């Protein structure tokens, strides 16, 4: 009934796929050494996830530092491709299904072109890794961003920014958030791009508007070719809305397990990580 996964890294091995650099910084010599390390710890975590039940995981927007960036100082593809060639292999051999999801300041829909370039750039990036890496069912997840004033105008600016990125276009899936945008309206920009809609059990409990989680899901599943992809967390009981717990509670999970119509990956967001009640 159910894959699991979870992000970016792994406790019990201390490997992460997310070491960065500050930008005064980044030079070749330094970038190579972070990035040697991350796709090390890349391995490690796949080699780990086919002996312990995991069949999907996060990779982190780290994992080559500062790939789009304007003053990237080599060619990463060129550097890497024959590595990511391999560990893609090793991701398939496994059964690992691969994500990625940027960050805050990917806004597709900002009113500042030169940041919806800089964001596409960090889509272009996180696609081609996906590629490189022969992630066929591979899915970017992007929320969609702040509203700047309108929520319409930004939408639109949104849909027209990501219509003509036909690479993205093909690991790209949207998600609900927090704040201003419930599974409902999700819905309908992931159908003006022809993508798949990811729920996120904890942001959609937060901002549910009309529908129930069942119903989330049952409207969600539809729009996967093949497997759906759920993200599941809860609200840590000491922090602000949103934050995620170190585990998921044994509610939530139920909560998750009855509303499901079908099948699912389930991606865990918890601190614990593979220790998340994953
Ligand atoms: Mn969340």
Same mark, same amino acid.
């Given at each position: 009934?159910?894959?699991?996964?979870?992000?970016?890294? &792994?406790?019990?091995?201390?490997?992460?796929?997310?070491?960065?650099?500050?930008? $005064?910084?980044?030079?070749?010599?330094?970038?190579?050494?972070?990035?040697?390390? &991350?796709? /090390?710890?890349?391995? /490690?975590?796949?080699?780990?996830?086919?002996?312990?039940?995991?069949?999907?995981?996060?990779?982190?927007?780290?994992?080559?530092?500062?790939?789009?960036?304007?003053?990237?100082?080599?060619?990463?593809?060129?550097?890497?491709?024959?590595?990511?060639? /391999?560990?893609? $292999?090793?991701?398939?051999?496994?059964?690992?299904?691969?994500?990625?999801?940027?960050?805050?300041?990917?806004?597709?829909?900002?009113?500042?072109?030169?940041?919806?370039?800089?964001?596409?750039?960090?889509?272009?990036?996180?696609?081609?890794?996906?590629?490189?890496?022969?992630?066929?069912?591979?899915?970017?997840?992007?929320?969609?961003?702040?509203?700047?004033?309108?929520?319409?105008? $930004?939408? /639109?600016?949104?849909?027209?920014?990501?219509?003509?990125?036909?690479?993205?276009?093909?690991?790209?899936?949207?998600?609900?958030?927090?704040?201003?945008?419930?599974?409902?309206?999700?819905?309908?920009?992931?159908?003006?791009?022809?993508?798949?809609?990811?729920?996120?059990?904890?942001?959609?409990?937060? &901002?549910?508007?009309?529908?129930?989680?069942?119903?989330?899901?049952?409207? $969600?599943?539809?729009?996967?070719?093949?497997?759906?992809?759920?993200?599941?967390?809860?609200?840590?009981?000491?922090?602000?809305?949103?934050?995620?717990?170190?585990?998921?509670?044994?509610?939530?999970?139920?909560?998750?397990?009855?509303?499901?119509?079908?099948?699912?990956?389930?991606?865990?967001?918890?601190?614990?990580?593979?220790?998340?009640?994953?």
């Amino acid at each position: 009934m159910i894959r699991l996964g979870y992000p970016c890294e &792994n406790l019990t091995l201390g490997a992460t796929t997310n070491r960065t650099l500050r930008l $005064a910084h980044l030079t070749e010599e330094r970038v190579r050494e972070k990035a040697a390390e &991350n796709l /090390r710890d890349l391995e /490690r975590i796949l080699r780990f996830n086919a002996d312990h039940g995991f069949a999907l995981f996060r990779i982190g927007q780290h994992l080559i530092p500062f790939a789009s960036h304007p003053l990237f100082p080599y060619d990463w593809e060129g550097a890497y491709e024959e590595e990511l060639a /391999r560990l893609g $292999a090793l991701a398939r051999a496994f059964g690992q299904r691969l994500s990625m999801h940027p960050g805050q300041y990917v806004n597709p829909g900002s009113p500042d072109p030169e940041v919806v370039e800089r964001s596409l750039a960090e889509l272009r990036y996180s696609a081609r890794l996906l590629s490189l890496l022969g992630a066929e069912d591979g899915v970017l997840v992007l929320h969609l961003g702040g509203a700047y004033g309108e929520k319409g105008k $930004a939408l /639109r600016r949104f849909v027209e920014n990501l219509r003509g990125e036909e690479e993205v276009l093909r690991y790209l899936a949207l998600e609900n958030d927090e704040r201003l945008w419930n599974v409902e309206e999700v819905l309908k920009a992931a159908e003006a791009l022809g993508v798949p809609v990811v729920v996120d059990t904890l942001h959609h409990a937060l &901002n549910p508007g009309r529908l129930p989680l069942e119903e989330a899901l049952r409207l $969600a599943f539809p729009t996967w070719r093949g497997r759906p992809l759920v993200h599941l967390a809860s609200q840590d009981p000491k922090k602000r809305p949103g934050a995620h717990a170190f585990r998921v509670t044994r509610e939530d999970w139920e909560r998750l397990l009855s509303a499901l119509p079908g099948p699912a990956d389930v991606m865990v967001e918890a601190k614990g990580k593979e220790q998340g009640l994953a």
